[PDB]
Amino acid sequence: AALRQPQVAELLAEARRAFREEFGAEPELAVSAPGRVNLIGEHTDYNQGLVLPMALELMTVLVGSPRKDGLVSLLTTSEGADEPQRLQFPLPTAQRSLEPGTPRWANYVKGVIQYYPAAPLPGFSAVVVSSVPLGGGLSSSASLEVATYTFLQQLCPDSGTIAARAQVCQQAEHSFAGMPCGIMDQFISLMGQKGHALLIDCRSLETSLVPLSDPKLAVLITNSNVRHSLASSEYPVRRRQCEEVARALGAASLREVQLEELEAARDLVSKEGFRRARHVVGEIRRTAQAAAALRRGDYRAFGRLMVESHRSLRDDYEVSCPELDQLVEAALAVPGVYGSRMTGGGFGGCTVTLLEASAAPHAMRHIQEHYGGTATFYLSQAADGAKVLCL
């Protein structure tokens, strides 16, 4: 009774009803974009490294219709959203551009509109709904950026590439939400495919769809239901730190630096700096092994490289928190768990447990009985990325 089911048919239905009530007519378009769990490859994306996320059945839906008057009218229904629930604004122009501000959920939609590369973009009316827990570490902000972007393509098709769309979504996260994120979360929300993880190369931007078929394997996501102060504050600090271990070692990114190099480079950088790399330069060179291991269906090893990812996130990158540590170390003692680790940016949010489906009922008994805080669970199929339904 801690498991939240996806309920995606009723999420779309909720959004259409709220649209008819709010705007006096039936919406003409539905889009969705998923949130994400990163299986392995944490704090690598901005280090031009490798990540292995998948898309969730947890998503953000826009339902809307173009307007003739050049203005945008938004209703959000998400419980967590900061007041007001509605905002309206003219389209940006050469003269006036959109500005971040109040309410914050709107900043994401504004950013994407502001950086949208095709024209002419008409005004629109839209309802925004999401089953992605807001600020819970499964990329609610990326689902809303990419859901926005997918709605704008229907209003005014772009003639570009999946990376250009991810950079636009990423720029809205930088400029309008003041969060200097990598490309992972936008990329997986765009490109996820049911029954697949997505191995992303954040240097080359090559991507591989890795079958996650086997119905033996389950991915249990557990929300800690915490977010520490340190989150919003330490993420850019870590990023900046990485950029100095890279600058010091005459490497254009840590992708280029290998562990044998960092170990014999100790003197050129700081104890906590060098330790940030043992994680990053290390991390890269085990998502690769996790990738090569999921293909072999090996599981143990992804696991080892996984718990090795948490331990490294906890001790070297210092971006876990006692709640995440107690959840990982808790699951990691249940036989049949290959691995568990913090996922996403850390300082709170979710862990990800690679278990055997048979044991799912007992784990959710156990974790809720053996976790100090409030556990929410998702038993997540690997899902589709951005989608359109004409209405």
Ligand X SMILES: O=C1CCCC2=C1C1(CCCCC1)N=C(Nc1nc3ccccc3o1)N2
Annotated binding residues for ATP, as ranges?
Answer: 135, 137, 139-140
User: Which of positions 205-264 make contact with ligand X (CB under 6 A)?
Assistant: none
**Beta-carbon contacts of residue 354 (< 8 Å; ≥ 6 apart):** 39, 217, 218, 219, 299, 302, 303, 306, 337, 338, 339, 340
- Choice between 122 and 135, CB closer to ligand GAL: 135
141 touching ligand X, by CB under 6 A = yes
Q: In the structure encoding, which two tokens stand for residue 291, read together?
A: 């990738």
Asked whether 34 and 136 are in contact (CB, 8 A), the reply is: no
Q: Which of 227, 221, 230 is nearest to 340 (CA)?
A: 221
Q: Which does 223 bind (CB under 5 to 8 A by kind): ligand X, ligand GAL, none?
A: none
Residue 151 in the binding site for ligand X (CB under 6 A): no
Q: Which of 310, 329, 308 is nearest to 320 (CA)?
A: 310
Residue 90 touches ligand X, criterion: CB under 6 A: no
Annotation: binding site: 36, 42-43, 45, 135, 137, 139-140, 185, 235
Q: Which of 130, 287, 309, 340 binds ligand X (CB under 6 A)?
A: 130
Compare residues 42 and 316 and give the one whose CB is closer to ligand GAL.
42
- Residue of 12, 15, 37, 42 that binds ligand GAL (CB under 6 A): 42
Distance of CA 18 to the CA centre of its chain: 26
281 binds, among ligand X, ligand GAL, none (CB under 5 to 8 A by kind): none
> What DSSP string runs through 347-378?
SEEEEEEEEEGGGHHHHHHHHHHH-SS--EEE
Q: At what angle do helices 162-175 and 105-115 cross, to 10 degrees?
A: 130
Q: What does the block give as tokens for 350?
A: 């979710």
Binding-site residues for alpha-D-galactose, in ranges, read 36, 42-43, 45, 185, 235
Rounded to whole angstroms, the Cα distance separating 348 from 136 reads 8
What's the order of all strands across the beta sheet hosting 207-211? 50-51, 196-201, 207-211
Is 279 a residue that touches ligand GAL (CB under 6 A)? no
Q: Does residue 189 belong to the site contacting ligand X (CB under 6 A)?
A: no
185 in active site: yes
Among 4, 16, 67, 104, binds ligand X (CB under 6 A): 104
Sequence letter at residue 104: R
* Range 98-116 burial, b when 16+ CB lie within 10 A, else e: bebeeeebbbbbbbbbbbb
Identify which of residues 187 and 371 has a Cβ nearer to ligand GAL in the complex: 187
For residues 368 and 322, the answer to whether their CB atoms sit within 8 Å is no
Min separation Cβ 363 and ligand GAL, Å: 23
Q: How far is the CB of 101 from ligand X (least distance, A)?
A: 12
| Nearest-approach distance from CB 57 to ligand X, in angstroms | 15
Q: Which of residues 2-41 bind ligand GAL (CB under 6 A)?
A: 38
Question: What residue ranges bind ligand GAL (CB under 6 A)?
Answer: 38, 42-43, 45-46, 181-182, 184-185, 344-345
Q: Give the catalytic positions in this structure.
A: 185
Question: What residue ranges bind ligand X (CB under 6 A)?
Answer: 60, 76, 78, 80-82, 104-105, 128, 130, 134-135, 140-141, 144
